[PDB]
Amino acid sequence: HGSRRNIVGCRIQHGWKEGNGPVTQWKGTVLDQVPVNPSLYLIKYDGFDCVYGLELNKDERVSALEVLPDRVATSRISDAHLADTMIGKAVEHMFETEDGSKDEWRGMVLARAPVMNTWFYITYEKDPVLYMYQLLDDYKEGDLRIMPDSLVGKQVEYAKRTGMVIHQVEAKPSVYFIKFDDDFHIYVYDLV
Ligand SMILES: O=C(c1ccc(C(=O)N2CCC(CCN3CCCC3)CC2)c(Nc2ccccc2)c1)N1CCC(CCN2CCCC2)CC1
Ligand SMILES: [Cl-]
Ligand SMILES: [Mg+2]
């Protein structure tokens, strides 16, 4: 009935059209495939640090999906001990604004990212979606300071809106990834 190759670990490009807007072009890297919903992929789009969830084969807003011949480089971590003990910790993450002023955001390092092995999954208190950064390099730069059964498959309802729990964070088993309807962000909540 039709068999194709898997796209996890591959870089892709596709067109995007929402509403009466024009078709825009995008490049990205497919990070993983959700077990409790294999149609849902986690993608890191070129030039942005949020991890997004899209059904790249069923979403009618997607067009001209192609797989690139690019091979994501398998670099070596410059500091395995720091990379290992940093996971699961609360952090202060320094960012830079327009005027050059510095914003500092409370976050938590969740895990090492797949496919891009020098990047880290991280979420923030005032922005609880899934982010990806090369945290070891910010740490050396001095912009990162470190501080001292599964619900996957269930649905969660919030009043601000329904989503599904798609992943349990290993280092913090009460923290889960949630994919909400009609929102391509991956939310990171503590479900207690
Ligand atoms: O460049 C972005 C950015 C990104 C995405 C977005 C943003 O929302 N999008 C951009 C790309 C995404 C790909 C998914 N589609 C791509 C094809 C299919 C679906 C989705 C949409 C954004 N939007 C924007 C830009 C200008 C004016 C109005 C809206 C902006 N930044 C700068 C860094 C900042 C960091 C915030 N964290 C710092 C500490 C804690 C929070 C985030 C915003
Ligand atoms: Cl904060
Ligand atoms: Mg603070």
Side-chain angles (χ1 to χ4, degrees), residues 104-106 125-126:
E104 178 178 278
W105 297 72
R106 288 198 188 182
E125 275 198 34
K126 294 174 180 174

Side-chain angles (χ1 to χ4, degrees), residues 14 16 26 45 48 52 54 95 105 124 127 131 133 184:
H14 65 81
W16 185 252
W26 299 87
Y45 286 99
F48 317 91
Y52 298 95
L54 297 90
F95 282 78
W105 297 72
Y124 303 97
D127 201 351
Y131 280 92
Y133 287 109
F184 40 49

